[PDB]
Design a protein around this ligand. Structure first.
Ligand SMILES: C[C@@H]1CN(C(=O)c2ccco2)CCN1C(=O)NCC(F)(F)F
Length: 120
C-alpha cells in the first residue's frame, strides 16, 4: 500500500470521528482567555482541532507526523493547565488521546512505509 498521499484523507476522516466524539467538545476551538485569563501565562503555544483541520485543508502539513505533533500539543496543553489529574476536561483529554493514538498508528506506519518504498 505505497500511496505517499493517502495520509491526508485518512487524517480528514479521523478528524471527522474526533469531532463526533463528545469528548472533543472543549478542544474544538482556541481556548477563550476571557474565561481563562491566565492561560497564555502557562501555555506558550495554544492548539485546537479546528486549527489542525484548517492547517490540513490549507495544504500546510507536509506529513502526518507534523499533524500528530500538533494534536499531541492539544493534549499536553490540557495536562499543563489541569489543577488535578481527576478533573473533567483532563479526563476527557485522556480518553480522546487514547482514541487518537489507536487510529493514527496505521496512518503513520503506512506513510513511512510508502516513503521507504519510494526511496528504495
Ligand atoms: C478550558 C477548556 C479545556 N482546556 C483544558 O485543557 C483544561 C484542562 C483542565 C482545565 O482546562 C483548554 C481548552 N478549553 C477551552 O475552553 N477551549 C475552547 C473550547 F472549549 F471552546 F474549545
Amino acid at each position: 500500500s505505497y500511496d505517499i498521499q493517502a495520509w491526508k484523507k485518512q487524517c480528514e476522516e479521523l478528524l471527522n470521528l474526533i469531532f463526533q466524539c463528545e469528548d472533543s467538545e472543549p478542544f474544538r476551538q482556541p481556548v477563550d482567555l476571557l474565561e481563562y485569563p491566565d492561560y497564555r501565562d502557562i501555555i506558550d503555544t495554544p492548539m485546537d482541532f479546528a486549527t489542525v483541520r484548517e492547517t490540513l485543508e490549507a495544504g500546510n502539513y507536509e506529513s502526518p507526523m507534523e499533524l500528530c505533533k500538533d494534536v499531541r500539543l492539544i493534549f499536553s496543553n490540557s495536562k499543563a493547565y489541569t489543577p488535578s489529574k481527576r478533573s473533567r476536561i483532563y479526563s476527557m483529554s485522556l480518553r480522546l488521546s487514547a482514541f487518537f493514538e489507536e487510529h493514527i498508528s496505521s496512518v503513520l506506519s503506512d506513510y513511512k512505509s510508502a516513503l521507504r518504498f519510494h526511496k528504495r
